[PDB]
Write a protein that binds this ligand. Structure first.
Ligand SMILES: CC(C)(C)c1ccc(CN(Cc2cccc(OCC(=O)O)c2)S(=O)(=O)c2cccnc2)cc1
Lengths: 340, 228, 128, 58, 266
């Protein structure tokens, strides 16, 4: 149509205007003002622990804010809560559906969420009054599979789904408080900022978006990648973030310059990134890959400075503890390992 | 101190003795993925046996779980990776459709050549043959104009069909089966096999076919432990 | 951004010839297997043809084999489809699609209703 | 036809609304990232090996 | 003067084959079973063969028992115990393969790798029982005409026939399991490569087992006069020994991949 034609023309005109503004705001590369600092040398970690007890591949894993308790979700239908110091299993929740793809820990330590192909994020209470661990809630209302759940507090939770929409739920009531639309592909990962006012989300349309939780609108959009985005993580200060995609490339985007700062890639890498995470200082960027290995990148110099090669199958999840002391890694060979 | 640590060890031992009972049940079950072309006849097959529907059945004291994705989108390059440990993908193809047959062929080619589905075998059910017989005897619906090598194709010598069918039906069925088997014999890495069959809504032998095919899959899986 | 701009369409008498072009930007064109798909009026999306990374492996659907020919220039990042002896049932909207992952031999959802790495397509009309 | 007009409205208004963003130069933001990485390089147990006595995973 | 040539090359080949086979696995239930098998064979070799080697330089065919006064009792005990151990290990491996190819579903749940380490402990237990039965003077050990070895005495006892019939039952069971697995491999090759090369390896294994273990059993049901005078009872045990030598070779070195790539290149 002619209306559709002029709408697409105006959209392209605004796109060109935004690109012009970005190129105007780009004066010096991050790799140009960082060449004066010294490199991190060589980072070589050792496998301190190895948690066994899962039957099938492990999709999710999330540290607790006490930096001691850990949760893992495997495809046999199990949600296991481990004590990471002494290796003892603290809980083992059996799930109603075997296809759990995500799991989360409450920042208070009282609840645990998990969702999957059943389009529901179930909330389990770990502190029942003289009872066992039983399901507290089942947040339903998504149309596609549930890719990520994240707690805001004991009463709010933000979820990503395979129907290209994110949602914000009030656990007490049980209905979607807010719905974040705009993506054109399945939303794969979401990341909360240090303060809980904003959060980023990556989808299968090779784009990432920044949402404000309270208003519910999209602030910024970042389109540096060229394939499906699998992993996303905020910088420790909340002014930048990092993504991993299937084009075998990680990217560090800025929230204030509104464009991509750094690219972490190597020609010898032809596998996609499944998970990314930052250390406590933000100088290290850990990235798990499909070639069964994990690579540590110098987030400022963009040069790889270590490898974590201990898993036999695809590295599915990867998480740094909230105090920066250990790194948990879960793979499709049904083993979580702690590195330090 | 020591009291909390011994309580934690008690809890861990109880959790582990429960996980053993759960592991013994997880190993006696064989999970199957029913992945039809959509409105292709998989509904009849699941009639014979939320976001995902599940059907449990039992053959000769062996337990089978069959999963079918429900409320999902038509894009399946992300939630299909969850089914790489499934022992078999049951792939239903509406053989009467011919362009849905090329769509099913492209789907089968993408599943066969996927990086994570490269060790998973496929039991292929070429359903809806009654309408195919109707259309090939009527001569109003053509396979020639959608598969230009239907002519020039001579029916193979093996696999004598049932005598109650018109030889043209046999020619069409074996043409489609060879169309799938060419992709299946595309060579390369994978360690997986295709077990094609000819079914209908009248059959009641399908669960035993799946049973025997899973038996052969498990046999070939065991046979790999005797190598390197 | 990942941009795929198709051109070359138009109205042509039955038996005529066309050459559709597809210009790509925002990705390494030589790492991806490319597809030509089409949507007919009142019908869904249909897979027409595809070509691999180097260009050695080429495939067409049944109803176009012998008439159309696909090709790719990795030096200029362009995908060409030459259509010969068109028929009245070739009138459709043609899309230039890229399948999502590089270096793979499988392209899953190029024919899905909402697919991100497609184009807007050109209308090819066959009439007299 | 008309079902595309609504989504085109959506996209064009989203672009109009996210085009008016104050974007500082890359220099200042990259310097802020460097300052954060340098001020907290002292508290990163993964960046420097911690003594094996206070390491909980000894 | 009786040359040690037959013992030297045999012991050398046995120990070198066991070491080459152990190196390539020292890095599934079949893995546990193969490592326990090669461990048992090599341990038996090191604990037995130096003893028969010792009475070659310490005597010019004059002092059969030079070392001690009851040493051949130890030799006979070790011989019987280690033969039972190796035969029972081969039986366990054949039974594992048979259940794996013959009854897959049943093998799918009940048999797990964790219970694989327990095979060695119970095999040693039953072997000690059935080999210490005579040591309580229910049987008798005697030194044989070559003087270099000691073994169960013919006559005046019913122990030799029991040992022979137990080994014969184990042999018959191993052969039945191997033939059933061959039948199943042929059937799954006809229903459909690797089946043909598995068949080659399993056929050569069955032949070298049935040719190198039946001589002893047949020569154990004969008169003591024609046995010692004709000097066949020595080869009757040497064949069981070369069976123990060949087993690790075709269980670890000539794996179906190796034979497949060799038949492909040739
Ligand atoms: C337990 C088992 C593995 C079956 C075994 C049994 C017996 C021997 C001793 N052996 C045979 C023997 C018997 C009787 C007399 C004799 O003496 C020979 C002579 O001088 O006539 C030699 S063995 O040849 O040392 C040898 C062969 C293969 C592997 N390991 C050692 C070794 C190993």
């Amino acid at each position: 149509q002619s209306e559709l034609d002029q709408l697409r023309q105006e959209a392209e005109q605004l796109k060109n205007q935004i690109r012009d503004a970005r190129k105007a705001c780009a004066d010096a590369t991050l790799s140009q003002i960082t060449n004066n600092i010294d490199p991190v040398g060589r980072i070589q970690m050792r496998t301190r622990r190895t948690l066994r007890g899962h039957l099938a591949k492990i999709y999710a894993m999330h540290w607790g804010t006490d930096s001691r308790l850990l949760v893992s979700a495997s495809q046999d239908g199990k949600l296991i809560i481990w004590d990471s110091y002494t290796t003892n299993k603290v809980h083992a929740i059996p799930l109603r559906s075997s296809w759990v793809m995500t799991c989360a820990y409450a920042p208070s330590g009282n609840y645990v969420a998990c969702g999957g192909l059943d389009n529901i994020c179930s909330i389990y209470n770990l502190k029942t009054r003289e009872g066992n661990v039983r399901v507290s809630r089942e947040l339903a209302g998504h149309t596609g599979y549930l890719s990520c759940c994240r707690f805001l507090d004991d009463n709010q939770i933000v979820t990503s789904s395979g129907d290209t929409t994110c949602a914000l739920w009030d656990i007490e009531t049980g209905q979607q408080t807010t719905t974040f639309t705009g993506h054109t592909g399945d939303v794969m990962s979401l990341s909360l900022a240090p303060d809980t006012r904003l959060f980023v989300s990556g989808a299968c349309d090779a784009s990432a978006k920044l949402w404000d939780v309270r208003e519910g609108m999209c602030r910024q959009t970042f389109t540096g990648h060229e394939s499906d985005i699998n992993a996303i993580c905020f910088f420790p200060n909340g002014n930048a973030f990092a993504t991993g995609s299937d084009d075998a490339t990680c990217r560090l985007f800025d929230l204030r310059a509104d464009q991509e700062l750094m690219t972490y890639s190597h020609d010898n890498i032809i596998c996609g990134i499944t998970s990314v995470s930052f250390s406590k200082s933000g100088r290290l960027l850990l990235a798990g890959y499909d070639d069964f290995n994990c690579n540590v990148w110098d987030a400022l110099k963009a040069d790889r400075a270590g490898v974590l090669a201990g898993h036999d199958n695809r590295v599915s999840c990867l998480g740094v503890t909230d105090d920066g002391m250990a790194v948990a890694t879960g793979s499709w060979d049904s083993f979580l390992k702690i590195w330090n | 101190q020591r009291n909390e640590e011994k309580a934690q060890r008690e809890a861990n031992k109880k959790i582990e003795k429960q996980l053993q009972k759960d592991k013994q049940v997880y190993r006696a079950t064989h999970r199957l993925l029913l992945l039809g072309a959509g409105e292709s006849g998989k509904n009849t097959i699941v009639k014979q046996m939320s976001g995902i529907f599940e059907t449990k059945f039992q053959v000769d004291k062996v337990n089978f779980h069959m999963f079918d994705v429900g409320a999902q989108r038509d894009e399946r390059r992300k939630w299909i990776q969850c089914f790489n440990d499934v022992t078999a993908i049951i792939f239903v193809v509406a053989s009467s459709s011919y362009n849905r047959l090329q769509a099913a062929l492209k789907l089968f080619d993408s599943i066969w050549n996927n990086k994570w589905l490269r060790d998973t075998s496929v039991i292929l059910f070429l359903n809806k043959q009654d309408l195919l017989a109707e259309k090939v005897l009527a001569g109003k619906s053509k396979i020639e104009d959608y598969f230009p090598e239907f002519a020039r194709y001579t029916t193979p010598e093996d696999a004598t069909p049932e005598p109650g069918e018109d030889p043209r039906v046999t020619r069409a069925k074996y043409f489609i089966r060879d169309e799938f088997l060419r992709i299946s014999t595309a060579s390369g890495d994978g360690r997986h096999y295709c077990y094609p069959h000819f079914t209908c809504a009248v059959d009641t032998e399908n669960i035993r076919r799946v049973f025997n095919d899973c038996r052969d899959i498990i046999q070939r899986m065991h046979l790999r432990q005797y190598e390197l | 951004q990942v941009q795929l701009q198709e051109s070359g369409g138009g109205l042509v008498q039955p038996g005529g010839s066309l050459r559709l072009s597809c210009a790509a930007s925002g990705f390494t064109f030589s790492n991806y297997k490319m597809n030509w798909v089409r949507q007919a009026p009142g019908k869904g999306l249909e897979w027409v043809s595809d070509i691999s990374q180097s260009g050695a492996s080429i495939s067409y659907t049944g109803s176009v084999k012998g008439r159309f020919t696909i090709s790719r220039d990795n030096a200029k990042n362009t995908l060409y489809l030459q259509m010969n002896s068109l028929k009245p049932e070739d009138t459709a909207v043609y899309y230039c699609a890229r399948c999502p992952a590089p270096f793979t031999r499988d392209c899953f959802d190029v024919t899905s209703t909402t697919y991100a790495y497609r184009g807007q397509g050109t209308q090819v009309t066959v009439s007299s | 036809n008309t079902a595309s007009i609504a989504q085109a409205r959506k996209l064009v208004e989203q672009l109009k609304m996210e085009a008016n963003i104050d974007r500082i130069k890359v220099s200042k933001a990259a310097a802020d990232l460097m300052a954060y990485c340098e001020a907290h390089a002292k508290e990163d147990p993964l960046l420097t090996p911690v003594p094996a006595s206070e390491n909980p995973f000894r | 003067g009786e040359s040690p040539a037959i013992s030297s090359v045999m012991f050398s080949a046995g120990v070198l084959g066991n070491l080459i086979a152990l190196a390539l696995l020292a890095r599934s239930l079949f893995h546990v079973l193969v490592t326990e098998l090669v461990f048992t064979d090599l341990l038996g070799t090191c604990l037995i063969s130096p003893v028969v080697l010792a009475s070659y330089a310490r005597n010019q065919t004059l002092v059969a028992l030079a070392p001690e006064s009851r040493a051949c009792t130890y030799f006979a005990f070790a011989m019987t115990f280690f033969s039972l151990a190796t035969m029972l290990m081969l039986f366990a491996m054949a039974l594992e393969r048979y259940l794996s190819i013959g009854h897959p579903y049943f093998y799918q749940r009940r048999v797990s790798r964790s219970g694989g380490l327990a095979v060695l402990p119970v095999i040693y237990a039953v072997s000690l029982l059935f080999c210490s039965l005579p040591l309580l003077d229910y049987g008798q050990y005697v030194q044989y005409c070559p003087g270099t070895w000691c073994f169960i005495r013919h006559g005046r006892t019913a122990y030799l026939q029991l040992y022979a019939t137990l080994l014969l039952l184990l042999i018959v069971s191993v052969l039945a399991c191997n033939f059933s697995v061959i039948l199943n491999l042929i059937r799954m090759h006809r229903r459909s490569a690797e089946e043909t090369d598995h068949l080659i390896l399993l056929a050569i294994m069955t032949i070298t087992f049935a040719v190198c273990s039946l001589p002893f059993t047949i020569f154990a049901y004969m008169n003591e006069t024609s046995s010692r005078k004709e000097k066949w009872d020595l080869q009757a045990l040497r064949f069981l020994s070369i069976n123990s030598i060949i087993d690790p070779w075709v269980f670890a070195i000539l794996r179906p991949p190796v034979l497949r790539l060799m038949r492909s290149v040739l």
